[PDB]
Write a protein that binds this ligand. Structure first.
Ligand code: NA
Ligand code: NA
Length: 327
DNA sequence: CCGACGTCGCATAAGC
DNA sequence: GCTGATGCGA
DNA sequence: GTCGG
């Protein structure tokens, strides 16, 4: 399917989704509209009516109604109205700043703070995260070409090995599935000395080395197991600077690493199907472990996992490359 | 009819 | 001061 | 908002 097939409907639903999350603060309506937009974006026909669309799982009576009015008039009275509402459109916009959620955006607009300009004049009202999000507003909304991701991966793997050659690092997400672009970099980290039944400095030393070679530029959050921050590729001589990128790094126990790598490689539709096929076979898979059920649903101890393939073996599936993990 | 809708690490607030 | 709740992102 | 027990 292509854009001009049902793009008007999906953009409409996505827009409605954002106002639910950011303004009405109804996260489940937000996910409902998104789910509806997703199943429509994949539907290989130009939708003629709300009734036709209601067949798809995720599209109910109200969205069917809203599709009918769009097809007949080319717009939605409610969407048009909230679009021009100065208060609501500002709350919705401010949430595009990383660190500014629905609650913060509401507070800012409550006291006349509506724009990036307003945010820039009111730095003392921003926490550390929001300042970084403000500083890199444009960059954070840019996607990352795979070639740059490869160059980013090169640096991460190199410095990680340089700190301790026994570290194991894996860049997951859509990148590992071979996507041509990425929204951010998701790095999963482990070490043989770190298990579940067992230094608290393993993550810090890696972050430290990446900051020191000036790859990591900023820190959003950082604990003993999870790092969230900003990075940037070195500028190729005289040429234009690279955009600042979002990078996450997590330290996972060795015995939970490949369950983690599997989960955060995705896709989410693939994960869903996989942990659906697994209950069938008497196993429960989460992001950490795989456990056996249990003649009455009582989960047993986590099974030993030493690779992604090990998980597939447990539930009698053949190993499927990250490339072929869209569903 | 009515509850589910993912879950959790980290920063920060909020109350004690 | 310490702790649980909340906000946020993923 | 949608699904389903
Ligand atoms: Na439906
Ligand atoms: Na935000």
């Amino acid at each position: 399917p292509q854009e001009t097939l049902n793009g008007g409907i999906t953009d409409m639903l996505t827009e409605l989704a954002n106002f639910e999350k950011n303004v009405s603060q109804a996260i489940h309506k937000y996910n409902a509209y998104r789910k509806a937009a997703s199943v429509i974006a994949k539907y290989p026909h130009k939708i003629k009516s709300g009734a036709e669309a209601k067949k798809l799982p995720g599209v109910g009576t109200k969205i069917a109604e809203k599709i009918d009015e769009f097809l007949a008039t080319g717009k939605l009275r409610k969407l048009e109205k909230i679009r021009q509402d100065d208060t609501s459109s500002s709350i919705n916009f401010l949430t595009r700043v990383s660190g500014i959620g629905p609650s913060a955006a509401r507070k800012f607009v409550d006291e006349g703070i509506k724009t990036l300009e307003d945010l820039r004049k009111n730095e003392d009202k921003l926490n550390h995260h929001q300042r970084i999000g403000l500083k890199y507003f444009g960059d954070f909304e840019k996607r990352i070409p795979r070639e740059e991701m490869l160059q980013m991966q090169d640096i991460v793997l190199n410095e990680v090995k340089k700190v301790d050659s026994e570290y194991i690092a894996t860049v997951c997400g859509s990148f590992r599935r071979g996507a041509e672009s990425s929204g951010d970099m998701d790095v999963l980290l482990t070490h043989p000395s770190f298990t579940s039944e067992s230094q608290p400095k393993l993550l810090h030393q890696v972050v430290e080395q990446l900051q020191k070679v000036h790859f990591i530029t900023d820190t959003l959050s950082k604990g003993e197991t999870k790092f969230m921050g900003v990075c940037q590729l070195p500028s190729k001589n005289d040429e234009k600077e690279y955009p600042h990128r979002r990078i996450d790094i997590r330290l996972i126990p060795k015995d939970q690493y490949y369950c983690g790598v599997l989960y955060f490689t995705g896709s989410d539709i693939f994960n869903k199907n996989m942990r659906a096929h697994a209950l069938e076979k008497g196993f429960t898979i989460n992001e950490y472990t795989i456990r056996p059920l249990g003649v009455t649903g009582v989960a047993g101890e986590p099974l030993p996992v030493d690779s992604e393939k090990d998980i597939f073996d447990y539930i009698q599936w053949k190993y499927r490359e990250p490339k072929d993990r869209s569903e």
